[PDB]
Amino acid sequence: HHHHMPKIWTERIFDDPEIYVLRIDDDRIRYFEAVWEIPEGISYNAYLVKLNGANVLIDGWKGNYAKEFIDALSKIVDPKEITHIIVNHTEPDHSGSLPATLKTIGHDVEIIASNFGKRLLEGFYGIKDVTVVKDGEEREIGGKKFKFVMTPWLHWPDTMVTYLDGILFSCDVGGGYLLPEILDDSNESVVERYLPHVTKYIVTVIGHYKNYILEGAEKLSSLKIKALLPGHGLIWKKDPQRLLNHYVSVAKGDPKKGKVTVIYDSMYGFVENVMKKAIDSLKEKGFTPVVYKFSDEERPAISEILKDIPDSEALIFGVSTYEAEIHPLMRFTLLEIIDKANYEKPVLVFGVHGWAPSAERTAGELLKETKFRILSFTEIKGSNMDERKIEEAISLLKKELE
Amino acid sequence: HHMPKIWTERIFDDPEIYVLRIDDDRIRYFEAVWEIPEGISYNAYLVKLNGANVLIDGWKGNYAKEFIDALSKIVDPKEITHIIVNHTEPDHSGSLPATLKTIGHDVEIIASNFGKRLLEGFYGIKDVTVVKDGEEREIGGKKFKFVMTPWLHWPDTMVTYLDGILFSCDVGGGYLLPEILDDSNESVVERYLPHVTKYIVTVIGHYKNYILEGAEKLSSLKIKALLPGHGLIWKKDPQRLLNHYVSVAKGDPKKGKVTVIYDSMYGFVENVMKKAIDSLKEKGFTPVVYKFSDEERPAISEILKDIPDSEALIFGVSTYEAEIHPLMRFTLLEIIDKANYEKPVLVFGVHGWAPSAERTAGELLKETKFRILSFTEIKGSNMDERKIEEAISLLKKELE
Ligand SMILES: [Cl-]
Ligand SMILES: [Cl-]
Ligand SMILES: [Cl-]
Known part of the structure; x- marks a missing residue:
């Protein structure tokens, strides 16, 4: 390796x-x-x-x-x-x-x-x-x-x-x-x-x-x-x-104008589909997203995610349900954000409605104990989804930042 | 193409x-x-x-x-x-x-x-x-x-x-x-x-x-x-x-198999684990070893694969802030979620100055099927290397 x-x-x-x-x-x-x-x-x-x-x-x-x-x-x-x-x-x-x-x-x-x-x-x-x-x-x-x-x-x-x-x-x-x-x-x-x-x-x-x-x-x-x-x-x-x-x-x-950090996991492509629309909506509205995706082919470095939080105007999370809780890499990411990067900034959460035991803590309730301010939760659905809800969430964020 | x-x-x-x-x-x-x-x-x-x-x-x-x-x-x-x-x-x-x-x-x-x-x-x-x-x-x-x-x-x-x-x-x-x-x-x-x-x-x-x-x-x-x-x-x-x-x-375990999982930030945990591993080998065990270090990071899927047929697990843990090393946290949580078995464990840990509120490796394992036979302290100076031998000998006795 080293010469x-x-x-x-x-x-x-x-x-x-x-x-x-x-x-x-x-x-x-x-x-x-x-x-x-x-x-x-x-x-x-x-x-x-x-x-x-x-x-x-x-x-x-x-x-x-x-x-x-x-x-x-x-x-x-x-x-x-x-x-x-x-x-x-x-x-x-x-x-x-x-x-x-x-x-x-x-x-x-x-x-x-x-x-x-x-x-x-x-x-x-x-x-x-x-x-x-x-x-x-x-x-x-x-x-x-x-x-x-x-x-x-x-x-x-x-x-x-x-x-x-x-x-x-x-x-x-x-x-x-x-x-x-x-x-x-x-x-x-x-x-x-x-x-x-x-x-x-x-x-x-x-x-x-x-x-x-x-x-x-x-x-x-x-x-x-x-x-x-x-x-x-x-x-x-x-x-x-x-x-x-x-x-x-x-x-x-202290935030950098326009900077939104988007962090999500996509197990099968349903989260990805919604996040792609959210990201395009952000871009249409003049924001400059920084995107971190956990997929079946890509895994970001946690150090790089953490680096981008302090100067973000806002964060957007896209979450899969998994067993009783959420996706394991999303758990790790959230726990490290809570530990290292707990800032009073607005957040949107998009999540799949799963069938996890009600005892399981959601990404949302984990985030609710932090300084972050969750503006809304939006459900990610396969078929039959109202894509107008994605635009509504991003519009809400824009108005919050204005 | x-x-x-x-x-x-x-x-x-x-x-x-x-x-x-x-x-x-x-x-x-x-x-x-x-x-x-x-x-x-x-x-x-x-x-x-x-x-x-x-x-x-x-x-x-x-x-x-x-x-x-x-x-x-x-x-x-x-x-x-x-x-x-x-x-x-x-x-x-x-x-x-x-x-x-x-x-x-x-x-x-x-x-x-x-x-x-x-x-x-x-x-x-x-x-x-x-x-x-x-x-x-x-x-x-x-x-x-x-x-x-x-x-x-x-x-x-x-x-x-x-x-x-x-x-x-x-x-x-x-x-x-x-x-x-x-x-x-x-x-x-x-x-x-x-x-x-x-x-x-x-x-x-x-x-x-x-x-x-x-x-x-x-x-x-x-x-x-x-x-x-x-x-x-x-x-x-x-x-x-x-x-x-x-x-x-x-x-169902493979006789002789022990899986050893640890993090080593600066070599203190590594020094203790090397001694524990040598002791296991001298007693005829065949350890499988996973080390999180400043150059190496095992796959969690590979660690998990080795759990079910291990006779026992050994963890070497660093304290970190109010809790434990973050990769050991992740690893332990996945073991508890996917591989919750009625097996004996040894824990070797560094004594931190972490806030007492923070959960230890012991607390994470409390509601699991795993039983911790002993906890041993890792020290960087004047550590009693006899304590390591005693722990490994305890485990061998437990497995008979
Ligand atoms: Cl998905
Ligand atoms: Cl160390
Ligand atoms: Cl974790």
Whole structure:
């Protein structure tokens, strides 16, 4: 499958403070967290800060790349001269190289983490001597002031960001999928192509906690932010506020005019027939549908469905009945939308009237517990159906959005 | 240019019976869910009698033109007098509207009571003769007997008995595009039956108790051949197929077989499972292993196929947010829905910091027939690897 080793970037990105990035481009991974389809890949970004009397490592790489990490680090510093390691987030996509790193340094170093971070490092790796920093705590290290800001539930309770002279090292906060062709936000075209992969990352990794994005953005707003250096994806040296505003806009679900996401299963073609008419009606009325169909020949990626929800003006679901409940892939999709992408947006539901036991929960009653506002339910029938009901539903949606 | 393969062949001389089989190699997901890279066939039958020609079932609607073309090579469709619809699901009935149009005059359509309702619902077909359980009809000088076998897997399902020959539609079906039409080669049969298990669990598993009821019901008939709507025709040894259906429905286990199902996000679950699997092997078990990882994602249909004849299951689970890993949730829910068997299970789990409200793997299994012998904690440091051995040894003792 893979013809080459993962691409590694090692570059000085600031002169004062002297900061290096160590980035590896993981094109081996297929499913982030063993669930989210990312054919585009993801990078892991670690940093080294070379100071006067200290060398500070910030974060690390996934453990399957530990050997590559130590080789890359050794090119920019003798690992024996490392004095501090800052662990903003202990998840193994960032901390997996830490045991090998500690072994290669060969002497004690100060490891800095949050309170929960300390507990997790002990749990994962048996690392015991960890210095805990509290919210807003400052430490003078190598002649410079580091400040630690807790940003819990982005997306674990251990998560924090490290601030140095206007430079924020933010680990998952500000991350995205995709392996960008450059390191930073200097080129407009690269940024525009990258941002939808940031949306996909936010919803899939942080969506359940999208309220804590808003709390975190507010907390970070009080800091002077000159640059944002995340643990995945692009570095933002020019316009970090653009990334923060994007995060907030995704978390708030700010809609793109005209965008309607249509998600359905069609076991035999009856749902398809109705959805095709609904989609054509939407197009006639000036909307731009984004369509995800589960059929006997096609299966969308759940990560891609999730990506499209936040900026949708509305959603339309087309549902088959199956046994006592609904179609299994539709169940999975709805449960993940509820978990990751629970937004106050209008919805239409189209469904086959089956013969499921009345005890079975409908797609409709599952959706009724969410923030979504179901405008109407429309029955999908084989023969004898009133196609005027499809147009009525789409017209109702148009009037709602007007 | 590749076209799905069509078989049209005379398979009995008296009565004169033809199969019309199409080998669907376009379909990827049966019922839009079950992964079937092996494909599935649609088998319809024509019985040519003295004064009648009886079509039994049909093909999926995307192959309606092909169906009419193939049918027209063995009979003038205008000479069809009767159509028997054992089951109205569109994989069998989709060609019916085109068939009716091509015949061009009224025919007697025969179905169960619920079948009749479904034909009207799907297609607007109103002229349907409802046959009752055990009803016999004389058509073309021969006696057809109709037997209701409901919930295999819809309430409309029946089978048609003709002189020892059972047209069974989904009952007795399998996935796979077999290399020959019938059960006349052992190697073909052996390779086929696991795809029959896959089919039973995925399509009929929720209603597996009705397999046992249906088999008991049919036991009063002398069956010389079984002609289903998918897969192989059984002319030599239909008993072998029926026994297979029953043993899957009962979950009769293969001694030594344990199915191990887990997710591993960062290698901690993998490390524990590798040790559990090695321990199983050292004690003489033959594990079947399904791992959800950041590079690999098994098909749920393949996991399901392996349940019924496992002596036991082992799950390795990560906690995730308030609940468990999302693919393990999906997997567990499908096992509970399709493969609810009275089998022992071991659970190995990571201890999360999930909200206590969220349901565990244990809560999901509580109302099922599965019994959890033990739960063991997966830890990343200072974990007691003795605990794994103890669990596997507990399971072996339980299975004696
Ligand atoms: Cl459908
Ligand atoms: Cl893990
Ligand atoms: Cl699910």
